[PDB]
Write a protein that binds this ligand. Sequence first.
Ligand SMILES: Nc1nc2c(ncn2[C@@H]2O[C@H](COP(=O)(O)OP(=O)(O)OP(=O)(O)O)[C@@H](O)[C@H]2O)c(=O)[nH]1
Ligand SMILES: Nc1ncnc2c1ncn2[C@@H]1O[C@H](COP(=O)(O)OP(=O)(O)CP(=O)(O)O)[C@@H](O)[C@H]1O
Ligand SMILES: Nc1nc2c(ncn2[C@@H]2O[C@H](COP(=O)(O)OP(=O)(O)O)[C@@H](O)[C@H]2O)c(=O)[nH]1
Ligand SMILES: CC(C)(C)c1[nH]cnc1/C=c1\[nH]c(=O)/c(=C/c2ccccc2)[nH]c1=O
Ligand SMILES: [Ca+2]
Ligand SMILES: [Mg+2]
Ligand SMILES: [Mg+2]
Lengths: 334, 437, 54, 427
Amino acid sequence: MYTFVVRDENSSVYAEVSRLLLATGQWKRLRKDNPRFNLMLGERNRLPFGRLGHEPGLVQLVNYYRGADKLCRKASLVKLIKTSPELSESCTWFPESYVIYPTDEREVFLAAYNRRREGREGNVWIALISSEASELLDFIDEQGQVHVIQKYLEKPLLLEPGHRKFDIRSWVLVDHLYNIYLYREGVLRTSSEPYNSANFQDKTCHLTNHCIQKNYGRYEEGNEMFFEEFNQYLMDALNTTLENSILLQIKHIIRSCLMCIEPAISTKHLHYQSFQLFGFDFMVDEELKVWLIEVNGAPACAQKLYAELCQGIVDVAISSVFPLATSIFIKLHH
Amino acid sequence: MRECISIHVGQAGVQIGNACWELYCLEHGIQPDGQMPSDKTIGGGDDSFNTFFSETGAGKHVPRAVFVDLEPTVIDEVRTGTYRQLFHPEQLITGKEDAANNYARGHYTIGKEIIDLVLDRIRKLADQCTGLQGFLVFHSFGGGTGSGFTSLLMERLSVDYGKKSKLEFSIYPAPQVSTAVVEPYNSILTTHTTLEHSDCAFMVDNEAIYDICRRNLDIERPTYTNLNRLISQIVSSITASLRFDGALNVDLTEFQTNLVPYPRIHFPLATYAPVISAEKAYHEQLSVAEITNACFEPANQMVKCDPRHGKYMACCLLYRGDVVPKDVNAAIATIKTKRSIQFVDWCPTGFKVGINYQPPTVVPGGDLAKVQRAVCMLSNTTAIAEAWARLDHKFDLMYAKRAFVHWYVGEGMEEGEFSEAREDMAALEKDYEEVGV
Amino acid sequence: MEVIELNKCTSGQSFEVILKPPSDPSLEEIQKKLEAAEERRKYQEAELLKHLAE
Amino acid sequence: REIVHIQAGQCGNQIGAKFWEVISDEHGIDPTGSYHGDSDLQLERINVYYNEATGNKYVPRAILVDLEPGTMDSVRSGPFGQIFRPDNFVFGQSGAGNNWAKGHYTEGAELVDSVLDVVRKESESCDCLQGFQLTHSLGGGTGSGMGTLLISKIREEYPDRIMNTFSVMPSPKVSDTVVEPYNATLSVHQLVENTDETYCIDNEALYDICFRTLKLTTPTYGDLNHLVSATMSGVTTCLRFPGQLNADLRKLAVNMVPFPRLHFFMPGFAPLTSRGSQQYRALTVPELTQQMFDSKNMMAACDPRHGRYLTVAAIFRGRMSMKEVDEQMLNVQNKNSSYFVEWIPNNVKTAVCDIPPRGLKMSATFIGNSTAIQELFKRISEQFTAMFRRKAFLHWYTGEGMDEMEFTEAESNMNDLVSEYQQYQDA
Ligand SMILES: Nc1nc2c(ncn2[C@@H]2O[C@H](COP(=O)(O)OP(=O)(O)OP(=O)(O)O)[C@@H](O)[C@H]2O)c(=O)[nH]1
Ligand SMILES: Nc1ncnc2c1ncn2[C@@H]1O[C@H](COP(=O)(O)OP(=O)(O)CP(=O)(O)O)[C@@H](O)[C@H]1O
Ligand SMILES: Nc1nc2c(ncn2[C@@H]2O[C@H](COP(=O)(O)OP(=O)(O)O)[C@@H](O)[C@H]2O)c(=O)[nH]1
Ligand SMILES: CC(C)(C)c1[nH]cnc1/C=c1\[nH]c(=O)/c(=C/c2ccccc2)[nH]c1=O
Ligand SMILES: [Ca+2]
Ligand SMILES: [Mg+2]
Ligand SMILES: [Mg+2]
């Protein structure tokens, strides 16, 4: 009889995980502040990693990797990529980005902003989306917090019929042995409104968030295109496949990012153990080249896939540690 | 030469002291009867080992140590121990009834009627010193004597010996080997009172030592004898610089300099390797690179924490055995590229190395195997704050219900001293935070 | 990289290697705290013997 | 660290004599008082309960009290009747007649000073007295009335000494008179104030154990006391035998009593055995741990699942794997951590003694400080109120100079004790 606690109620994902665990009749849920747990579905902020693995006669596990936030914060991700020799300055799959502090690499950003203007090529960026450096810096200093200025992808791949923009979400699970598991089912969070190249003011076709979009539900149910359809579209429209044209790059980026920070967050020889579900967001251009936008440490799944994914998390990340009395994942070997 | 006096308070301190002085005698070739055949300067001298030993006309080398407990049981075993002739009665002080795991009882009640006696016996040793550096204090956070009477003593030593340094060797409480439940209280209380009086304190979590004995020595249920013999090795590595010829950490003041930039943050994390079972056969001798890399494995630390998610302020490497500078620098160069070793911006990212050609001495019939080379890394990392967080959390849980508080108030303590001591710990956790992130 | 302050002897040697440069209460007060707590005990023991006297 | 034993009344002396009969066998002392053992472990801590006599004899540091010479004459004519010091036999003639008032105010007041003279004489011979222990019932008059009177006066003369008690609670199942709830309520009021640790030995539980578990159709007081003496021998093991443990009565009290008034513990023992019936199979460590936590083994008719454990102390005896013990103990906690308060970290401590008791290869004694003990006090309160609401049988007490107010106060204080246990049961 294993025991666990829940310290994040807003977790749509692990609300399903806990539900599944209780339904096995071998997992019991304790109170929030009961330290005698085997598993900890912890909070997002101020997670007490320091109090883990100190309970005698209790193998402890947590659904978060301490230090993974360096990958899941935009300001940190840019720094991580620019400073890590494994990824380096000339990282091919990460858009040109700079960290800007409200009144730092501001002077470095302007140096590149000039080559774009003194080259008569695409000089559009994103924090809002603008082509002028002045309108951007004034916006950052008016908000308050730190922002990152990133090169905007002016030539994205556009779905048809619709001339629609989109972004790819991949759910990745890293177990206690640091095995990198990619969920076979992803999702294209699409824009229902056609992409407008000239007017950047209309952020309803540049930004493909599920909330902003909610033309909702015109082409596919809920502005969400799964892989079997997007793969079929590529075959019919571009004579290629999702596996070859896009997914190899995705699996490369995922494998690269997690290999980089492995020696920092790995709980291999620690007194407590860690796993974590990640949410990688990508952006494909017209020449079928995958770009990494960012990484979510606390991702929400899609309605159709909650039943399958949450079960998978229990199977490989939890039950692997705490056993009970074909696979949906793709293991990115390293 | 400048002398050092060791103070052993409570059961933990006394028994650990026995383990250390047992080991010191083996290292310096001193016999249980106090005779040191290698000492050609009969009657006295000012060698490196005279820091911990004074000499009589008969050629006996006695420790500059004072054992104190509020109960005769433990120290009596020293009076009748194998090294009974080593010390002399005035060094061994015992009370009637102990502090019953009560800080207030050990500090205020029972501590008050014996503090003058101890300071007098300490003063007797201090008069035999030509130039006293300071004191090395051994105790436990959990015990009423080790916590209560220690803090009281440390307060008075700062008065009677203002210019002298004071180092601590504390035993952090572990439920696996303690039958006391009120340890979090005693720990917070003694830390708050001793913080401004201690220059450098080496914490030792029994949890860590317990698992190290289970994992590496293959002992199912480690006893205090098993723990102490392993602890005495670490302590020996730390104090070897004071007892032998060298240039690194030759004085107690240098411990503060090399490890403690900020006063309040004076809790260096100790890591030791290699720990090999004496019952183990076909043991492959580990190299300089293999043991130095083991100084950055959490499973070898004296306190379980993650230095990766903390910042370094200082770091010393204390080797013992067949080691040369060339092999060290080659090991450091490898580790630096393969591990997360972050230093604070206002400190240089470097290592102060100290090598002693004599390999580590092991107690005959002990659990530890003889090795060709061993190392003890002393690193002041903010990651050790995790030990305070665990301790303060347990404190908050009990104190929120005022559980066991009546025992302390019943000895004259005020309930305000609980919150006052907790507030100081809260401030301490913040200090680690600022430096850490 | 940079080895410095290398000191050698027969017992061993020591040095420093830099990889990168940077970027009390009196005896009066004590006795005043110990005795104050003693009075709190004497008062508690008095209220007991008073209570028992009743 | 010496301990002074006292035993008052019929029950107190019958249980007390039984206790000395058991531990005297463990320490290898014969009825004459001469040591005839084989292990030095039997003599390393014999000073705790025995005084060393002239001819190398060992005399129990015990004081026998009663307001009638009946029982104490049965003790002196008993098996280990000769071992006791004759000067320590303090007795009256009138008796208490199962009246608390007679034991605490009138009859007992005449004799109490005579007892204290013996206590003082024993204490002055101690190198370092660590505390007292009393054995008595609460349903009678002497052990209840005079027993609490002694405690009140011992605290007056020894304010800084630990006072423990082995108290037998009354029950209708095993009842002598109807005024037992009265005597018990009056005594509990005294025990809440003037004792560090009280071991509630419910006669109801002892009966149900003999009847349901031990399969005894009609259990006598001898059957009940066999269970008590075995338990008493257990909770005194850690002091009577050495092993690497350095704690006196005070230290144990500090780690068992988080709140002063809430110091009433539930005794427990495993394996439960009946007199004579030798068991042949030694229990495993998992079996000892499961039974000692089972309600069927609790010697206080209370359901531990109806409350929460503040602190727990278990002592295993015999040759066993201390690792296996630690595993099984940590297993019970992590399986039922809801019945342990989370605001007292690691409140379940355990020790092991190599020396097993007589007849058993290995056993375990349970000392639980549970809030479920309130069920016992509530039970006595109902029985008390049922009679007191009609002022029944009250003339036996008012005839001894007592007022109705003193009953109302004792009623209120016990109801306050119940509410206190309920406070921490929801925390
Ligand atoms: N490592 C180690 N820890 C010990 C030893 N002895 C006791 N301890 C620890 O000390 C804590 C309790 O303090 P003690 O030293 O036993 O008590 P004390 O210092 O004598 O003070 P009193 O309570 O008055 O007896 C427990 O948490 C033990 O784990 C020992 O020999 N070695
Ligand atoms: N450099 C870039 N080029 C083009 N589009 C970009 C971009 N950076 C972000 N976007 C667009 O912005 C939208 C959301 O941006 P981003 O993902 O940074 O915000 P967000 O991270 O708060 C949502 P989530 O955390 O769920 O992925 C995406 O739909 C993507 O289309
Ligand atoms: N276990 C046990 N309980 C007893 C014994 N004798 C009396 N009692 C209990 O004690 C109460 C009677 O008290 P008693 O000892 O006769 O009073 P006293 O002798 O005047 O102090 C009743 O509730 C009984 O259940 C005994 O020998 N064994
Ligand atoms: C660690 C261990 C199991 C020794 C422990 N921890 C807290 N309590 C105990 C045991 C006891 N604690 C007690 O308070 C105790 C009381 C006692 C002892 C002797 C005689 C009468 C009562 N007897 C015990 O055996
Ligand atoms: Ca000499
Ligand atoms: Mg002690
Ligand atoms: Mg009777």
